[PDB]
Amino acid sequence: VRTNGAPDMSESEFNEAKQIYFQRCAGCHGVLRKGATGKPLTPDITQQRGQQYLEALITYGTPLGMPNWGSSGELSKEQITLMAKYIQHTPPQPPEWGMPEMRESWKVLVKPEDRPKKQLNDLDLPNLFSVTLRDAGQIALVDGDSKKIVKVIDTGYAVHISRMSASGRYLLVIGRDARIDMIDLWAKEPTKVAEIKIGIEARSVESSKFKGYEDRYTIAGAYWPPQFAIMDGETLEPKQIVSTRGMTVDTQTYHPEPRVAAIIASHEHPEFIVNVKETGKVLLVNYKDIDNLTVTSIGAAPFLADGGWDSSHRYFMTAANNSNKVAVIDSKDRRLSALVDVGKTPHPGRGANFVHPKYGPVWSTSHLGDGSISLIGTDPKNHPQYAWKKVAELQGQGGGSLFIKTHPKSSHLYVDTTFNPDARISQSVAVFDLKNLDAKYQVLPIAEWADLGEGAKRVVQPEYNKRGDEVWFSVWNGKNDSSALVVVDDKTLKLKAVVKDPRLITPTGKFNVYNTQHDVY
């Protein structure tokens, strides 16, 4: 084993590092090391740094995300030297991940027969918040009423998102390394009952949400290998694995590695909606019969990204990279209803739904560059003159917002500005009065409200509670600085509570059980 410019090693050293890479590093550094979360670790870059620089970085780690492998004792001094050597060599082809490997990683910590037949705690589960602790590598269960952290669960290092099972009993979390952990909220102390790994890199997970199929199936989509898997919603046992490799929608030529951009459970039929990126296809995977799977392939647009349901939960509004068009998927009739041409490039996400006084039910989406927000009619039944058209456009504080949120019981539309260049703006949120949209938004000083007075204090993601009278926001501040969660009374737009705890390490995503379980947005 010799690559063109750094440390010759060999085969009982290469394959060892290789194993560790795909199992412990690819989650953030990319399967081919082109990078994702972490920076790219290609040869040219790694060589210039030199063996020593590399070992220091791996052992100690950076406070901006990179774990410390030596200090934590996760890896050995000898192993860290192999990795430093390994990353300087040409990147090999990533391994496949089939049934043997999935079953290998499948572990049931608590058999279904040994789980509580009912809810063994006093927790108000529906108003619980599953807050992601980005750098701490875990999730925090926060009581929506007592406003205190109820339980801290260790997930992994690349904790990405949380999802709920249709019964409201199971908390599902996935990592960017394709590891999934199942949590039973009915135990004395809510805990992990099962886990499994479905690939090398992943971003999606969802449960069966069609009536009658509560807790029947759990699906997860990967970046690598190009595939998605359906597991038993009760034990996480891997049932079927499907490849997303195939022909593109535009050029209709073969594509060797299409990534699963997003997944969403359908309400119209017993099926999962899978967005495949490079091929531009929205797959409808029917799970009425898992032994003999039925899949409908809906051509949309190239480079599919994320999306969300319209108010009725029938039309899936989806964005595409480098495209000002929102592909509308009819999940009932299983077809492409439209390619709505909004102004600029829509920012990938669930979006926000509300009833515009003048236009009826609309679905909105923000624009990263100028902070504007596009509205689209989503009621062809009673408002056909507006259905599937950019009906209007709002204006926020400015650039770089990551989330927008509203609620059926609320009269406000909250929109952040996390990545705005102006520090002041990135520390606040805009609140739109849906009753008077001709008015300018109001600016809520979220960061000023906890109290922290240090760093960037980035403010991210508005999330309501079960009722719809409270709105929570995370107040970032990296590992060793101090973080908090701010709560506002939606009816009064006044501060209501500030959550602090030495355990609230870099809180980001917040998932209210009920609102996640029922797709309320």
The reply on whether position 116 binds a second copy by CB under 8 A is no
**Token pair in block for residue 29:** 């550094």
Residues in contact with ligand HEC, counted by CB under 6 A, come to a total of 23
Asked whether 446 and 460 are in contact (CB, 8 A), the reply is: no
The reply on whether position 387 binds ligand HEC by CB under 6 A is no
Q: Which stretch binds a second copy (CB under 8 A): 17-25, 162-170, 286-294, 320-328?
A: 286-294
Residues in contact with a second copy, counted by CB under 8 A, come to a total of 30
The single residue among 127, 365, 374, 461 that binds ligand DHE, judged by CB under 6 A, is 461
Asked whether 220 and 232 are in contact (CB, 8 A), the reply is: no
Determine if residue 259 is labeled as part of a ligand binding site.
no
Q: Which is nearer to ligand HEC, 25 or 429 (CB)?
A: 25
CB atoms within 10 A of CB 183: 25
Cα(first)–Cα(last) distance of the chain, in Å? 53
Determine if residue 25 is labeled as part of a ligand binding site.
yes
Residue 125 CA to residue 128 CA, distance in Å, equals: 5
The single residue among 508, 512, 515, 517 that binds ligand DHE, judged by CB under 6 A, is 508
Residue 514: which H helix or E strand, with range? Answer: helix 513-517
Determine if residue 176 is labeled as part of a ligand binding site.
no
The reply on whether position 136 binds ligand HEC by CB under 6 A is no
Determine if residue 62 is labeled as part of a ligand binding site.
yes
**Which of 516, 517, 460, 471 is CA-nearest to residue 494?**
471
Q: Contacts with ligand DHE in 67-106 (CB under 6 A)?
A: none
The reply on whether position 248 binds ligand DHE by CB under 6 A is no
The reply on whether position 39 binds ligand HEC by CB under 6 A is yes
Contact of residue 39 among a second copy, ligand DHE, ligand HEC, none (CB under 5-8 Å per partner type): ligand HEC
Determine if residue 28 is labeled as part of a ligand binding site.
yes
Q: Phi and psi (nearest 5°) for 448? A: -65, -35
Q: Contacts with ligand DHE in 468-497 (CB under 6 A)?
A: none
The reply on whether position 104 binds a second copy by CB under 8 A is no
Residue 463 CA to residue 426 CA, distance in Å, equals: 17
Determine if residue 350 is labeled as part of a ligand binding site.
yes
**Token pair in block for residue 98:** 């089939």
Sheet order of strands, 484-489 included? 459-464, 470-475, 484-489, 494-499
Asked whether 70 and 57 are in contact (CB, 8 A), the reply is: no
Residues in contact with ligand DHE, counted by CB under 6 A, come to a total of 21
Q: Which residue type is seen at 226? A: P
Contact of residue 54 among a second copy, ligand HEC, ligand DHE, none (CB under 5-8 Å per partner type): ligand HEC
Asked whether 143 and 128 are in contact (CB, 8 A), the reply is: yes
Q: Is 101 helix (H, G, I), strand (E, B) or coil?
A: helix
Contact of residue 253 among ligand HEC, a second copy, ligand DHE, none (CB under 5-8 Å per partner type): a second copy
Rounded-to-10 torsion of CA 133, 136, 138, 142: -40
> Minimum CB separation from ligand HEC for residue 79, in Å?
8
Degrees to nearest 5, angle at CA 516 with 511 and 518: 160
Cα 302 to its chain centre, rounded Å, is 21
Residue 197 CA to residue 192 CA, distance in Å, equals: 15
Degrees to nearest 5, angle at CA 261 with 225 and 222: 25
The reply on whether position 132 binds ligand DHE by CB under 6 A is yes
Site track for ligand DHE across 299-318, x = CB under 6 A: -------x------------
The reply on whether position 168 binds ligand HEC by CB under 6 A is no
Q: Which residue type is seen at 502? A: P
Q: Which stretch binds ligand HEC (CB under 6 A): 21-29, 178-186, 248-256, 444-452?
A: 21-29
Q: Contacts with a second copy in 331-350 (CB under 8 A)?
A: 334-336
Cα 366 to its chain centre, rounded Å, is 17
The reply on whether position 340 binds ligand DHE by CB under 6 A is no
The reply on whether position 196 binds a second copy by CB under 8 A is no
Q: Compute the Cα dihedral for 225, 230, 232, 233 and give only its sign.
A: positive
Q: Is 164 exposed, middle or buried (0-12, 13-18, 19+ CB in 10 A)?
A: buried
**Token pair in block for residue 300:** 């949309």
Q: Phi and psi (nearest 5°) for 232? A: -70, 125
**Token pair in block for residue 42:** 């290609």
Q: Which stretch binds ligand HEC (CB under 6 A): 23-31, 266-274, 295-303, 396-404?
A: 23-31
Asked whether 211 and 270 are in contact (CB, 8 A), the reply is: no
The single residue among 82, 171, 182, 263 that binds ligand DHE, judged by CB under 6 A, is 263
The reply on whether position 262 binds ligand DHE by CB under 6 A is yes
The single residue among 31, 66, 283, 304 that binds ligand HEC, judged by CB under 6 A, is 66
Annotated binding site: 25, 28-29, 49, 62, 66, 160, 203-204, 223, 350, 461
Residue numbers of the site for a second copy (CB under 8 A)? 96, 98-100, 225, 227, 240-243, 245-247, 251-254, 289, 291-299, 334-336
Residues that bind ligand HEC (CB under 6 A): 20, 24-25, 27-29, 37-39, 41, 54, 57-58, 62, 64-67, 69, 83, 87, 157-158
From the annotation, which residues make up the binding site for heme d1? 160, 203-204, 223, 350, 461
Binding site for ligand DHE (CB under 6 A): 37, 132, 134, 160-161, 203-206, 261-263, 306, 349-350, 402-403, 460-461, 508-509
